Design an enzyme around this catalytic site. Structure first.
Site, PDB file in Angstrom:
ATOM      1  N   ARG B   9       0.804  -1.041  -0.078  1.00  0.00           N
ATOM      2  CA  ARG B   9      -0.084  -0.069  -0.026  1.00  0.00           C
ATOM      3  C   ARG B   9       0.950   1.145  -0.125  1.00  0.00           C
ATOM      4  O   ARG B   9       1.733   1.366   0.760  1.00  0.00           O
ATOM      5  CB  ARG B   9      -0.979  -0.118   1.084  1.00  0.00           C
ATOM      6  CG  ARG B   9      -2.176   0.795   1.057  1.00  0.00           C
ATOM      7  CD  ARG B   9      -2.971   0.475  -0.028  1.00  0.00           C
ATOM      8  NE  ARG B   9      -3.937  -0.712   0.231  1.00  0.00           N
ATOM      9  CZ  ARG B   9      -4.823  -1.089  -0.684  1.00  0.00           C
ATOM     10  NH1 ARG B   9      -5.158  -0.465  -1.823  1.00  0.00           N
ATOM     11  NH2 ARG B   9      -5.712  -2.097  -0.417  1.00  0.00           N
ATOM     12  N   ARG B  10       0.938   2.058  -0.876  1.00  0.00           N
ATOM     13  CA  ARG B  10       1.819   3.464  -1.257  1.00  0.00           C
ATOM     14  C   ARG B  10       1.664   4.060   0.071  1.00  0.00           C
ATOM     15  O   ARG B  10       2.635   4.653   0.436  1.00  0.00           O
ATOM     16  CB  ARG B  10       1.147   4.026  -2.368  1.00  0.00           C
ATOM     17  CG  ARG B  10       1.394   3.310  -3.645  1.00  0.00           C
ATOM     18  CD  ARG B  10       3.021   3.906  -4.315  1.00  0.00           C
ATOM     19  NE  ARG B  10       2.896   3.321  -5.664  1.00  0.00           N
ATOM     20  CZ  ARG B  10       2.729   3.806  -6.847  1.00  0.00           C
ATOM     21  NH1 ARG B  10       2.324   5.028  -6.840  1.00  0.00           N
ATOM     22  NH2 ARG B  10       2.672   2.958  -7.875  1.00  0.00           N
ATOM     23  N   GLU B  39       6.654  -0.958 -16.322  1.00  0.00           N
ATOM     24  CA  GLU B  39       7.293   0.014 -17.315  1.00  0.00           C
ATOM     25  C   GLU B  39       6.067   0.168 -18.304  1.00  0.00           C
ATOM     26  O   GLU B  39       5.011   0.817 -17.713  1.00  0.00           O
ATOM     27  CB  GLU B  39       8.463  -0.652 -17.962  1.00  0.00           C
ATOM     28  CG  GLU B  39       9.739  -0.754 -16.986  1.00  0.00           C
ATOM     29  CD  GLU B  39      11.104  -0.807 -17.926  1.00  0.00           C
ATOM     30  OE1 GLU B  39      10.972  -1.402 -19.121  1.00  0.00           O
ATOM     31  OE2 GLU B  39      12.086  -0.303 -17.510  1.00  0.00           O
ATOM     32  N   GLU B  82      -4.192  -7.699  -7.003  1.00  0.00           N
ATOM     33  CA  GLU B  82      -2.965  -8.491  -7.238  1.00  0.00           C
ATOM     34  C   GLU B  82      -3.043  -9.833  -5.897  1.00  0.00           C
ATOM     35  O   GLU B  82      -2.538 -10.769  -6.523  1.00  0.00           O
ATOM     36  CB  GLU B  82      -1.863  -7.584  -6.576  1.00  0.00           C
ATOM     37  CG  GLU B  82      -1.269  -6.536  -7.562  1.00  0.00           C
ATOM     38  CD  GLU B  82      -0.384  -5.482  -7.108  1.00  0.00           C
ATOM     39  OE1 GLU B  82      -0.280  -5.378  -5.719  1.00  0.00           O
ATOM     40  OE2 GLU B  82       0.277  -4.703  -7.800  1.00  0.00           O
TER      41      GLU B  82
HETATM   42  C1  LIG Z   1      -2.315   3.303 -11.078  1.00  0.00           C
HETATM   43  C2  LIG Z   1      -0.947   3.280 -10.327  1.00  0.00           C
HETATM   44  C3  LIG Z   1      -0.632   1.765  -9.586  1.00  0.00           C
HETATM   45  C4  LIG Z   1      -1.694   1.498  -8.669  1.00  0.00           C
HETATM   46  C5  LIG Z   1      -1.421   0.432  -7.998  1.00  0.00           C
HETATM   47  N1  LIG Z   1      -0.094  -0.470  -8.229  1.00  0.00           N
HETATM   48  C6  LIG Z   1      -0.088  -1.551  -7.432  1.00  0.00           C
HETATM   49  O1  LIG Z   1      -1.040  -1.924  -6.424  1.00  0.00           O
HETATM   50  C7  LIG Z   1      -0.093  -1.425  -5.063  1.00  0.00           C
HETATM   51  C8  LIG Z   1      -0.377  -0.150  -4.925  1.00  0.00           C
HETATM   52  O2  LIG Z   1      -1.634   0.186  -4.434  1.00  0.00           O
HETATM   53  P1  LIG Z   1      -2.394   1.765  -3.926  1.00  0.00           P
HETATM   54  O3  LIG Z   1      -1.487   2.105  -2.823  1.00  0.00           O
HETATM   55  O4  LIG Z   1      -3.693   1.597  -3.617  1.00  0.00           O
HETATM   56  O5  LIG Z   1      -1.839   2.861  -5.321  1.00  0.00           O
HETATM   57  P2  LIG Z   1      -3.167   3.613  -5.800  1.00  0.00           P
HETATM   58  O6  LIG Z   1      -3.517   4.696  -4.774  1.00  0.00           O
HETATM   59  O7  LIG Z   1      -4.270   2.631  -6.416  1.00  0.00           O
HETATM   60  O8  LIG Z   1      -2.412   4.606  -6.964  1.00  0.00           O
HETATM   61  C9  LIG Z   1      -1.181   5.334  -6.747  1.00  0.00           C
HETATM   62  C10 LIG Z   1      -1.175   6.292  -7.854  1.00  0.00           C
HETATM   63  O9  LIG Z   1      -1.039   6.039  -8.883  1.00  0.00           O
HETATM   64  C11 LIG Z   1      -1.268   7.239  -9.769  1.00  0.00           C
HETATM   65  N2  LIG Z   1      -1.763   6.915 -10.838  1.00  0.00           N
HETATM   66  C12 LIG Z   1      -3.107   6.556 -11.318  1.00  0.00           C
HETATM   67  N3  LIG Z   1      -2.963   6.507 -12.763  1.00  0.00           N
HETATM   68  C13 LIG Z   1      -1.758   6.576 -13.064  1.00  0.00           C
HETATM   69  C14 LIG Z   1      -1.003   6.192 -14.257  1.00  0.00           C
HETATM   70  N4  LIG Z   1      -1.849   5.957 -15.531  1.00  0.00           N
HETATM   71  N5  LIG Z   1       0.166   6.244 -14.429  1.00  0.00           N
HETATM   72  C15 LIG Z   1       0.869   6.609 -13.334  1.00  0.00           C
HETATM   73  N6  LIG Z   1       0.375   6.803 -12.111  1.00  0.00           N
HETATM   74  C16 LIG Z   1      -0.856   6.602 -12.022  1.00  0.00           C
HETATM   75  C17 LIG Z   1      -2.380   8.031  -8.626  1.00  0.00           C
HETATM   76  O10 LIG Z   1      -1.715   9.142  -8.307  1.00  0.00           O
HETATM   77  C18 LIG Z   1      -2.503   7.253  -7.715  1.00  0.00           C
HETATM   78  O11 LIG Z   1      -2.669   8.189  -6.262  1.00  0.00           O
HETATM   79  C19 LIG Z   1       1.324  -2.081  -5.413  1.00  0.00           C
HETATM   80  O12 LIG Z   1       1.219  -3.186  -4.934  1.00  0.00           O
HETATM   81  C20 LIG Z   1       1.205  -1.857  -6.858  1.00  0.00           C
HETATM   82  O13 LIG Z   1       2.062  -2.714  -7.426  1.00  0.00           O
HETATM   83  C21 LIG Z   1       0.604  -0.124  -9.205  1.00  0.00           C
HETATM   84  C22 LIG Z   1       0.414   1.108  -9.944  1.00  0.00           C
HETATM   85  N7  LIG Z   1       0.135   3.220 -11.348  1.00  0.00           N
HETATM   86  C23 LIG Z   1      -0.026   2.763 -13.141  1.00  0.00           C
HETATM   87  C24 LIG Z   1       1.353   3.659 -11.043  1.00  0.00           C
HETATM   88  O14 LIG Z   1       1.556   4.199  -9.972  1.00  0.00           O
HETATM   89  N8  LIG Z   1       2.595   3.892 -11.911  1.00  0.00           N
HETATM   90  C25 LIG Z   1       3.979   4.570 -11.571  1.00  0.00           C
HETATM   91  C26 LIG Z   1       4.911   3.417 -11.319  1.00  0.00           C
HETATM   92  F1  LIG Z   1       6.015   4.051 -10.924  1.00  0.00           F
HETATM   93  F2  LIG Z   1       4.456   2.743 -10.234  1.00  0.00           F
HETATM   94  F3  LIG Z   1       5.018   2.699 -12.427  1.00  0.00           F
END
Ligand SMILES: C[C@@H](c1cc[n+]([C@@H]2O[C@H](COP(=O)(O)OP(=O)(O)OC[C@H]3O[C@@H](n4cnc5c(N)ncnc54)[C@H](O)[C@@H]3O)[C@@H](O)[C@H]2O)cc1)N(C)C(=O)NCC(F)(F)F
Ligand SMILES: C[C@@H](c1cc[n+]([C@@H]2O[C@H](COP(=O)(O)OP(=O)(O)OC[C@H]3O[C@@H](n4cnc5c(N)ncnc54)[C@H](O)[C@@H]3O)[C@@H](O)[C@H]2O)cc1)N(C)C(=O)NCC(F)(F)F
Lengths: 140, 140
Positions: B9-10, B39, B82
């Site tokens: 959880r982030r 990626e 996941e």
């Molecule tokens: C979507 C995001 C993502 C989400 C979840 N998980 C998996 O789920 C667990 C984390 O869960 P959770 O803590 O609930 O995260 P969540 O709050 O839901 O989203 C966090 C932030 O993602 C932002 N965001 C939304 N949309 C996009 C997008 N299109 N692109 C980039 N950011 C996006 C938004 O700012 C939100 O706030 C982990 O185990 C991880 O493995 C993996 C990934 N994502 C694709 C991402 O990050 N990419 C960056 C990278 F560095 F991680 F690759």
């Protein structure tokens, strides 16, 4: 004698302080953090001396990390104690910013307000390797 | 194809998840964590293929880590997705317990309740090296 003292709040900076310790050790620094290097004896003396012995003072500014220092004028809080020691020895203070919000100086006891005048490194979850590389450059 | 997928959880487990990735890599495991290995492309497909491809599924159970899973009956929460993928593929699920409170199963969607039947490892801030050695024992 360790090169780096890591000062941190247990309830909010424990994981980052440990992560910082792992990386700094991988890059060749001797690191003091309490759970691995504070050993037998009266910890009041041991902690203060460990601050004094380390050239670098790495301060983990997690959210609210200086809250318990506020109005701690009788100097009972341990992060407060460590900062004042680091300040009075002219240590290389390197704050690590992890969601910390910059407070007005007047909310802190006067003997530690100068800690906010040191240049801090913003911690980046997405670019951790580059964050570590910057911390190493700040180190002496 | 990484050996270990780290789900976390982030807002509460980023630092522990990152600290686990460093330790596991130092002991020779290829690790997937999103900020290092997720990626280009549509992330929904890539995240699920990454879970599917990794033998070990390390789940960082920080406080409240499954809260957003509760009532997520459309399976829109990413930790929920996941976990269900890990359970469906019969992965070696290794929960890491860091101030997590064990909930009654019924508060979780039925397709992920089995996650709590897996043996978890209590994270110890005082004995991190011992914790890491135990985790490595659990891995395949
Ligand atoms: C979507 C995001 C993502 C989400 C979840 N998980 C998996 O789920 C667990 C984390 O869960 P959770 O803590 O609930 O995260 P969540 O709050 O839901 O989203 C966090 C932030 O993602 C932002 N965001 C939304 N949309 C996009 C997008 N299109 N692109 C980039 N950011 C996006 C938004 O700012 C939100 O706030 C982990 O185990 C991880 O493995 C993996 C990934 N994502 C694709 C991402 O990050 N990419 C960056 C990278 F560095 F991680 F690759
Ligand atoms: C006293 C304690 C200690 C406190 C502070 N700091 C420095 O201050 C920063 C953290 O500050 P902070 O987050 O506010 O911690 P604090 O809440 O105040 O106390 C934390 C817990 O210590 C428990 N406890 C109380 N009394 C004792 C005692 N006699 N023995 C062992 N535990 C004791 C109490 O249960 C409390 O809960 C760091 O930079 C660190 O360097 C360093 C150390 N301490 C000596 C300690 O841990 N020893 C274990 C070791 F592994 F760390 F070595």
């Amino acid at each position: 004698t360790p090169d780096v003292f890591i000062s941190y709040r247990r309830n909010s900076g424990s994981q980052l302080a440990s992560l910082l310790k792992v990386h700094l050790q991988l890059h060749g620094f001797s690191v003091f953090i309490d759970v691995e290097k504070l050993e037998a004896g009266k910890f009041e003396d041991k902690l203060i001396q460990s601050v004094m012995g380390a050239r670098n003072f790495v301060l983990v500014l997690s959210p609210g990390a200086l809250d318990k220092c506020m109005q701690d004028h009788d100097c009972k809080d341990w992060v407060h104690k460590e900062i004042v020691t680091a300040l009075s020895c002219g240590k290389n203070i390197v704050p690590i910013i992890d969601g910390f919000e910059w407070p007005e100086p007047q909310v802190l006891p006067e003997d530690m307000q100068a800690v906010l005048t040191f240049n801090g490194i913003k911690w980046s979850h997405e670019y951790q390797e580059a964050t570590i590389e910057k911390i190493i450059r700040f180190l002496q």
